[PDB]
Amino acid sequence: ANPYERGPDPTESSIEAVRGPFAVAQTTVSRLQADGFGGGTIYYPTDTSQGTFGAVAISPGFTAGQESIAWLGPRIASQGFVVITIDTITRLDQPDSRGRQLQAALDHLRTNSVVRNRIDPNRMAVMGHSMGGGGALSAAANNTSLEAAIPLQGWHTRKNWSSVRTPTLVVGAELDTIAPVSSHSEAFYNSLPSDLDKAYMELRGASHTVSNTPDTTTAKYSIAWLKRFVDKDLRYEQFLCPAPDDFAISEYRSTCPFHHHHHH
Ligand SMILES: *[C@@H]1O[C@H](CO)[C@@H](O[C@@H]2O[C@H](CO)[C@@H](O)[C@H](O)[C@H]2NC(C)=O)[C@H](O)[C@H]1NC(C)=O
């Protein structure tokens, strides 16, 4: 039995839900309290009776505040995760710096007085939009212990991610002119190792700003990815393999079926 399964058996409805099965509360981390990042908001399930939860850090992109990705906080946390949406030290920080700040935000959770006993410190993930998604890839390349990475319309000058050993969902926007998929998202997917559990999801007709207000497709598959890999929850593979049928997805590539390591 998988000790990390949380919540009821999922359906497409449950992963599309704006609020998941877990009631959530929040706490604020000021810049003074934040070593190595610009502060943030932590969303967490109040129900402790099922055990601890994996942790997720989410970064905004260049010139953007926490507000540009804040909606992901409660939407993911209510599926059974402790999620910190960060501000960066400055809004002009570059992608690798954002990766270091994502890692610093995860490390903060380990001793945060409100959530330190709610996280499993060894099951953590990174996400981000635009340069923050470049940061998510950078954090994974710099920390092979991370359990999942999700760049959303990621932007980075580094195109080669062959050293990443963290299951990665790359979400591109078809009509993105800021981080065009042909030179950013798709190139990232192509250079991730072939033996990695990975997927590329292109959002039909979408512009760069698709991640800055609620997008059900982004939320539902981020949730399924975090469940499948942060929690090793095989109940969620059904949504990722075979390729999803959503109209909002114009292209899907993956290494389905994903690896299931076992001692049977
Ligand atoms: C990978 O993580 C390490 C550890 O945080 C980073 O190395 C630090 O980088 C900062 C500024 O970049 C330096 O001030 C520290 O002295 C470095 N620490 C060590 C132990 O070397 C490294 O930059 C990260 N890599 C990337 C690409 O962001």
Numbering used by the authors: 2 to 265
What does the paper say about this structure?
Plastic pollution has become a global environmental challenge, driving interest in enzymatic polyethylene terephthalate (PET) recycling by using polyester hydrolases. Metagenome-derived polyester hydrolases, such as LCC and PHL7, have garnered significant attention due to their high activity at elevated temperatures of up to 70 °C. Their engineering led to the development of optimized variants, including LCCICCG, LCC-A2, Turbo-PETase, and PHL7mut3. , PHL7mut3 has been designed to improve the activity and thermostability of PHL7 by the Q175E, L210T, and D233 K mutations. In this study, the PHL7 wild-type enzyme and the improved PHL7 triple mutant PHL7mut3 were expressed in E. coli and P. pastoris, and their PET-degrading activity under various conditions as well as their thermal stability was assessed. Both the PHL7 and the PHL7mut3 sequences contain three putative N-glycosylation sites (N143, N144, and N161). To assess the impact of mutations and glycosylation on structural folding, we used X-ray crystallography to determine the structures of PHL7mut3, expressed in both E. coli (E_PHL7mut3) and P. pastoris (P_PHL7mut3), as well as a non-glycosylated variant with three additional mutations (P_PHL7mut3_ng), also expressed in P. pastoris.
